[PDB]
Design a protein around this ligand. Structure first.
Ligand SMILES: CCCCCCCCCCCC(=O)OC[C@@H](O)COP(=O)(O)OCC[N+](C)(C)C
Ligand SMILES: CCCCCCCCCCCC(=O)OC[C@@H](O)COP(=O)(O)OCC[N+](C)(C)C
Lengths: 449, 449
């Protein structure tokens, strides 16, 4: 409806996405109470129907495209099951399908179109194929976590269709594995063997936090937007103020993402999929499929402290299915680039993503070098601080972290060859030149000390 | 000059290219008579100067890009000389440079721009890198051709610069190897151990034939052009006539290529680079760096007989450095489906090339299947012919060959999504559907017989 779209002050696409995400709670409540007896095919059909309904509500003309990619893989997965070339052909097919979709969409403004659910689906399917090939090997140890994380059996059409179309983690949801989905289907993922998983208390906290972030972001949205950055006229304000804007911006655009992940956690933890075990005391731990770690993402002066708390899940998937599969190159420095290149193509086909990831690589390397210089061969360095007082150091580090994360996040939201450089040149290319000088000078001063 | 361009009836680019190609003959005549004493650096400097002048007279200010590829490789070739990763990095760098040039250069007409000399240069440099890598291995009993080609030593800047900028084979010239260039530089490519090689008699034939083809093509150029097909008002004559046009066309557009190769052969055979050995009788053989074999390209009813008579210096290079190097994977078909893909990218970035190469692959497979069915399992099918009277079969086969080679060469000269399909749909997609039906039916009828 256009009336509600104009009333809420945002485009109808975002409202439709939010209502689709929020519609998962009644589905989970219905599932948790009417499926005590298993009869797994009921769960599989229910998941398929709910996922198809969710896809039809939003993308109600092109959803059958997804129904293609599930079926074709099932053929490729069936024949040449354990050969190496199956992995190659499925990887190439999925990549070329995604690239064709991206090329034929190629919209300039940020739009929530057909692309993202298919992106999540195709990455999950590649993961499933890799896992099946890995589990097809000999039953020896092979890094026992890898052994227990593999799949053994025949993945018939019903199981793969149900696992592909989970209603909760479909749009932007967390990426689970194949082995644990069958555990949920077979009902061995509960707090105790013979009762419903008691998870009401964890879910409300996540829902409250996600709603709080959502409401504060939508309240603070009109004040700051990615149009003041150029405006063709306001590129004359005092330099410091401009930097201050980049400090206020970036920290606000991130809250657009966070909330949805948090809220989808609420629909993913209620069904019991977020169980991993108990702690030393024995109490249950529900932080298994979490996509965000609040209270560490905020207060983290280190540049590397925002890489293990922001995305966490996709990063873990990339590390597990790229680094562990390219141990025969042996360079140890090429792979860390190649993975990023893959992460620079999975997001999109524009140019801003490459520059953003290059800046992230440069900043993390510089931070590693600086933290290696101190506290390892400090001499005067540590006893100069002597831990007498570090309020000023902490606040300066925090401001530096915010400013130089927003400064590299600018090309993420503006991914055109013209607007990016037009808004980026007014800052005198500060970050790249400064960090290049630091990188080229630091070994010399380290050798001096 | 525009006056000569309008007088000759062709654009100034073609005339400039032809005059540049023809300008090599005084260079070769000067070289053959004033360089009895070797002092190799004189030859290297002469080659560099002549190649740079030729590049200047065609592409005035842009030629430095070519230099920007010769020097960088010399660095990559110097450090990490014998490692595996050197091949990977030089391959990726050359491919991405060529792709960037093509993407920034792409136009909708056939333009003689910066691309082609850089394309030849980059493919030659990739070949040099592969050959140098295959020279640092153990000197065991490899394949004799590998030992005959492998280079041992360190290529300094002068030698690589001279070998890269050969004046004769620069624009569209044949692609020789690295080891034999040093043989020419050291003066051992002669009929008699020491004297000027006797090559006047072989050379004049390649001028007579080349000039004959050139004059016939330029005389018959105005009658047939690639505009009558797409005029959209000439698509209404009866069906057969249209097919007849495709028979007359295609066989004419090919003569645009042939001549130049022939003529550059004349400037490549005079210097003595076309020597390979003697025959059984003992007379010299000069068909070493030939790029086309006339008297077999014309009268060849077989569809596979036009692959060993067209350009046999790029096909041989591809087979030597891709087809017979990816034997570790061991599929025997995927490689045949991979190398062509490389050949589908080296030509350009448009879409017509892929379809043309796919059609060539399909027709050659169909021809192989048909020739396998006959003369191997006749079953009273050919024992009755006994060569009684079959000129009709020969002429029918020749007409079929011409028609279905032109029908697949059409997308080569028209490489846009719109023009190609508009000109191709009026023929009712005859070749693809016919060959698909033949491919799907032939095994069944073979099993029947
Ligand atoms: C209150 C309004 C709610 C707004 C809805 C936005 C949902 C966040 C998208 C998360 C998708 C994802 O997992 O990729 C994470 C990153 O990749 C971010 O992705 P992008 O923001 O660049 O979107 C284009 C790239 N896709 C297509 C691959 C998703
Ligand atoms: C009387 C007038 C003379 C006309 C001059 C034309 C010269 C023939 C080009 C041969 C280049 C080559 O070796 O590639 C052979 C094929 O690749 C053909 O190539 P194309 O015709 O498609 O040209 C674009 C592709 N390049 C850029 C790679 C060369």
């Amino acid at each position: 409806l256009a009336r509600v779209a104009e009333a809420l002050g945002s485009s109808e696409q975002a409202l439709r996405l939010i209502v689709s995400i929020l519609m998962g709670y009644p589905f989970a409540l219905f599932q948790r109470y009417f499926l005590f007896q298993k009869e797994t095919y009921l769960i599989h059909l229910y998941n398929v129907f709910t996922g198809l309904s969710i896809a039809y509500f939003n993308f109600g003309m092109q959803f059958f495209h997804s129904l293609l990619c599930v079926l074709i893989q099932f053929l490729i997965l069936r024949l040449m099951g354990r050969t190496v070339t199956a992995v190659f052909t499925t990887f190439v097919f999925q990549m070329t399908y995604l690239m064709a979709g991206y090329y034929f969409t190629a919209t300039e403004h940020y739009d929530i179109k057909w692309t993202m659910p298919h992106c999540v689906l195709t990455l999950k399917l590649i993961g499933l194929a890799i896992d099946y090939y890995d589990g097809g090997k000999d039953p020896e140890l092979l890094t026992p976590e890898q052994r227990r994380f593999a799949v053994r059996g025949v993945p018939t059409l019903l199981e793969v269709s149900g696992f592909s179309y989970f209603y909760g983690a479909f749009m932007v949801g967390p990426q689970f594995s194949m082995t644990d989905y069958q555990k949920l289907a077979k009902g061995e993922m509960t707090d105790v063997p013979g009762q419903r998983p008691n998870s009401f208390v964890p879910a409300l906290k996540r829902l409250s936090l996600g709603l709080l972030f959502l409401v504060t972001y939508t309240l603070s949205s009109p004040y700051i937007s990615e149009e003041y950055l150029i405006s063709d006229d306001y590129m004359e304000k005092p330099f410091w103020f401009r930097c201050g804007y980049i400090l206020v911006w970036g920290k606000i655009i991130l809250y657009k993402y966070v909330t949805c992940w948090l809220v989808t956690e609420g629909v993913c933890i209620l069904v019991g999929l977020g169980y991993n075990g108990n702690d030393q005391n024995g109490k249950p731990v529900w932080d298994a499929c979490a996509n965000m770690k609040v209270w560490l993402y905020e207060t983290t002066p280190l540049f590397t402290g925002t890489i293990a708390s922001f995305n966490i899940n996709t990063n873990a998937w990339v590390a597990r299915y790229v680094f562990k599969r390219l141990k025969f190159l042996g360079n140890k420095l090429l792979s860390q680039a190649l993975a990023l290149f893959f992460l620079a193509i999975w997001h999109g086909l524009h140019s801003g993503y490459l520059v953003c990831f290059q800046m992230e690589l440069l900043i993390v390397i510089v931070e590693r070098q600086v933290i290696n210089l101190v506290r390892d061969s400090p001499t005067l360095s540590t006893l100069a601080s002597i831990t007498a007082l570090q309020p000023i150091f902490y606040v300066l580090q925090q401001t530096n972290h915010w400013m130089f994360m927003g400064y590299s996040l600018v090309p993420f939201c503006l991914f055109t060859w013209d607007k990016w450089m037009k808004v980026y040149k007014s800052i005198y290319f500060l970050g790249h030149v400064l960090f290049f000088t630091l990188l080229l000078v630091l070994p010399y001063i380290r050798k001096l000390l």
